[PDB]
DNA sequence: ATCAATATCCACCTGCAGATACTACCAAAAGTGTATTTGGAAACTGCTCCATCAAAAGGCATGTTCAGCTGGATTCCAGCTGAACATGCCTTTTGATGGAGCAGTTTCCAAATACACTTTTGGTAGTATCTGCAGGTGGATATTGAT
DNA sequence: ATCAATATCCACCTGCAGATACTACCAAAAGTGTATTTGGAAACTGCTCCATCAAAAGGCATGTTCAGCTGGAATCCAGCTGAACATGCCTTTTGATGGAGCAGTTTCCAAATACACTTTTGGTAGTATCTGCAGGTGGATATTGAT
């Protein structure tokens, strides 16, 4: 029946999110689509290699963590390391 | 029921970035956490593009981003520029920018 | 005595004009037959999806203005205006795409 | 009628003087040598035969005879010119 | 105990074919490994993507071929897909 | 029957048991067919062959028996397909081809 | 006297010549200091992160051998 | 009069006499003091394997070498053969270092 | 052309860091036997969309003329950078002792996987209707260049 | 500085491709519940090898003097390359149609996984012998540079 999921619905909730009334293109929406799809892959690839440098086989929010650390800059590390930690420490507070 | 996302206060879904973690041979094994981090990771950085983009599109006078307002917003920022280095933004153009000696003075 | 603007002033009204827009420079149709062309002597019967053309389209383009900047930075570093093949070849050279 | 197919050749020609001026100007260029626009063909000529080459080969490997977007995106990709805007 | 694996005594071996009376030095027999296992590596993961990006679950000699025909330059590849080709059809024709 | 290793019927002086194992354990894919470790580890061995080959003859025209970290250098930097190859590798104590610019050497240029 | 300057004006230049230099300009000594410099706080920054993770006080070659090969300058002779 | 080679002579003297060997060229306990005390403002009380200063040192003199050898071809491109800072900084920007 | 001052090379020599040959031991790597599961090749085909044809037209390529100003050649010389020395600071070595901590081992449990059901949802297909902005016009203001 | 030929800016406007909006359908997704397996954190520790010393021995960095020759400034000018213009083609655009071929759906077995069990082997360790070649000495001769 074709099924192709991206994450234009979850760009677009953001994107309300923080501009309540802009819109985006299928362009633009297509190029954001290929920017988190590229980010979940370097940083997958990343926290896959560090748990087979270690000798683990499971790929944890730590090794998730240090990819991130390795994979962004300065200023975006740090941020996107505490909006993850929150995130984590937030699930983990929930049954 | 309460997905894992709202369960974690994120808009990106935990669900299906968890599965897309098993699916594509990154472990034997990929912890709860592991998508949780991710999904935020990611959806902190869609975030920050989407913020500086709209506001170049409001600089430029027009209510729907497109490429090249990511293409302007991501080569004016240092990191994201660092971070994207090497992808090519189609539709974006360039950044303006004109070597100073190609400029011309000194009368005629 | 008809009005002549002076040799450069249209060439940077021209970078100007150009860096301010994003659409493809070069033409449609011939880019698709070139590209049909160096895919044709790899190998035969083969065809496109319109999408295929235009990604090699965005990806050669790209690819030519950026190394066009380089090699405006080599001819600017011999103190001159006017890039030439030498520039090209040494922006390649330290590019690492060449020997 | 099938016959005799256009026969391709010289396309690279195709690569105009106007259209190697603008992507310079593009690139910031303000003075262009009279030998650029044949190095240029020349440069854009080995850089497609490098994409189209591998993107061919991804399609070969799926036992297609249709290239997609995603075969010369992952084409790009394996060359270090990661192209966001076509899928993948 | 304490083990640690590397190609060196297969290395030696291939040495000894193509050059009976020639030896080698440990520095460049790390070399020779680190080429190996970068050889690996590099065929292992593009083999990876090409069963990815056609859904299949299996690497299979023929995503091995195809690994080697994008990774390796011309002649190189046209031999390594010889010598490849060659071990796999002596190896059938086996038990 | 006499067990013959996989290397050994495969003809091959690299462990196809190995390199199948490290398939399987390198997080590759769900699935990891016969035939690609023998084809792995023949190319493999090919590459390994054919700079072992080029690096011997460059220890014997150094009058040398040991091949040493020197001699792959030359005989990587010296080959167009092997330097494009390893393009983005430096190997240890390799030092560079000698290669002096035209215009530096002496009266003018 | 401290050490980024430890790396002296003569083994700058014999980096130099090993490069094919002839004549070196008086300014290039600091100019070089400063990309070695830049250099190894991107290689050891990411060893030492490779070290953490691992939860070690002691940075290993292979820490180093991995922190080249992200930065896209592959190392071999040292393991891996 | 005493003897003395002309400028230049001893300096391709020395590129020959480098260019053959493969020796590391950075004294190692200099170098190993920079590491330790870049290290040092990442993380404290680290210890290091005597190999891993070593590959860092041989990454190190591979990376300024090859650096060395665009910068010469940088100064050769505006006609000179005494490399410059600029000449640094152009191989760089055209590398993506500096970019 | 002459010849002195040095650098460079070849032939030979010899200690020893490092490569080598032999034995002993064992976890784990690897092959074999068999019983069960299943990926994905075949075969058939629905349906997308790629190739191709048609016709009109004006946006843009092409060829040309003209001359402004850039590149390339030449000349000149201030002063930076190489060569050679005299000092002597500090790396290098090697010998050897604590002890930090890497790495191996035994326990043990929070968290992962497998499995069965159930409830929710993101993607789509069919249809319809708004709305941001591309492309055009027309007049006001700005930039460029000749005087 | 003034005047004119043009480029550039901006407000206003209209068509419409793209964006957006409900209605509906459901296959795969995602969450819940229990049960069963296990990865690797935690604590203890043996021994590998990293940090620090000691402490000469001298290799090599640093400061200095001198001037060769390079970098860069200043000039001159042929002719390349930019701007403008006439001409007209071939790319772009719009709409249509056949059909190649991509992709969905079901069937089915060769090949892979899952295991138990036997056999083989690459790696660690000891103890011990051998050897390619680094580094040193002579003396020959090639190179460089002053005459
Ligand atoms: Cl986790
Ligand atoms: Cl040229
Ligand atoms: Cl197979
Ligand atoms: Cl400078
Ligand atoms: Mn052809
Ligand atoms: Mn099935
Ligand atoms: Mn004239
Ligand atoms: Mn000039
Ligand atoms: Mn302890
Ligand atoms: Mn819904
Ligand atoms: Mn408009
Ligand atoms: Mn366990
Ligand atoms: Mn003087
Ligand atoms: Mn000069
Ligand atoms: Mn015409
Ligand atoms: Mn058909
Ligand atoms: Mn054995
Ligand atoms: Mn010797």
Redesign the interface.
């Given at each position: 029946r074709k099924r192709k999921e991206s994450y234009a619905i979850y760009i677009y909730k953001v994107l309300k999110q923080v501009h309540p009334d802009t819109g985006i293109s299928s362009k633009a929406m297509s190029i954001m689509n290929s920017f988190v799809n590229d980010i979940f892959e370097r940083i997958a690839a990343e926290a896959s290699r560090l748990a087979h440098y270690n000798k683990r086989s499971t790929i944890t929010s730590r090794e998730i963590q240090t990819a991130v650390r390795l994979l962004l800059p300065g200023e975006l590390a740090k941020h996107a390391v505490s909006e993850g930690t929150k995130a984590v420490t937030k699930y983990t507070s929930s049954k | 029921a309460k997905s894992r996302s709202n369960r974690a206060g994120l808009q990106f879904p935990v669900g299906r970035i968890h599965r897309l973690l098993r699916k594509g041979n990154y472990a034997e094994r990929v912890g709860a956490g592991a998508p949780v981090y991710l999904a935020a990771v990611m959806e902190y950085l869609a975030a920050e593009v989407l913020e500086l983009a709209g506001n170049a599109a409001r600089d430029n006078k027009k209510t729907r981003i497109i490429?090249?307002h990511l293409?302007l917003a991501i080569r004016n920022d240092e990191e994201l520029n660092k971070l994207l280095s090497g992808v090519?933004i189609?539709?974006?153009?360039?950044?303006?920018?004109?070597?100073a000696?190609?400029?011309?003075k000194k009368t005629? | 005595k008809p009005h002549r603007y002076?040799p450069?002033?249209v060439?940077?009204r021209?970078?100007?004009?150009?860096?301010?827009?994003?659409?493809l420079?070069?033409?449609k149709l011939?880019?698709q037959?070139?590209?049909?062309?160096?895919?044709?002597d790899?190998?035969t019967?083969?065809?496109?999806?319109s999408?295929?053309v235009?990604?090699?389209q965005?990806?050669?383009?790209?690819?030519?203005?950026?190394?066009?900047?380089?090699?405006?930075?080599?001819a600017?570093?011999?103190?001159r205006?006017?890039?030439?093949?030498?520039?090209?070849?040494?922006?390649?050279?330290?590019?690492?795409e060449r020997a | 009628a099938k016959r005799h197919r256009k026969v391709?050749?010289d396309?690279?020609q195709?690569?105009?003087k106007p259209?190697?001026?603008?992507?310079?100007?593009?690139?910031?260029?303000?003075?262009?040598?009279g030998?650029?626009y044949e190095?240029?063909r020349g440069?854009?000529?080995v850089?497609?035969?490098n994409?189209?080459?591998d993107?061919?080969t991804y399609?070969?490997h799926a036992k297609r005879?249709?290239?997609?977007?995603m075969?010369?995106?992952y084409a790009?990709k394996r060359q270090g010119?990661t192209?966001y805007?076509?899928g993948g």
């Open positions: - | 490429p090249r293409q090519t189609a539709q974006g153009g360039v950044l303006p920018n004109i070597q000696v190609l400029l011309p005629e | 002076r450069g002033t060439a940077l021209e970078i100007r004009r150009y860096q301010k827009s994003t659409e420079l070069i033409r011939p880019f037959r070139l590209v049909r062309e160096i895919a044709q790899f190998k019967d083969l065809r496109f999806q999408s295929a235009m990604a090699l965005e990806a050669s383009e790209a690819y030519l203005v950026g190394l066009f900047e380089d090699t405006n930075l080599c600017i570093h011999a103190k205006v006017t890039i030439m093949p030498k520039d090209i070849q040494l922006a390649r050279r330290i590019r690492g | 391709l050749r396309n690279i195709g690569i105009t259209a190697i001026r603008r992507l310079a100007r593009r690139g910031g260029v303000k003075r262009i040598s030998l650029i190095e240029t440069v854009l000529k850089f497609l035969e994409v189209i080459r993107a061919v399609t070969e005879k249709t290239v997609t977007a075969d010369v995106v790009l010119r192209l805007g076509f």
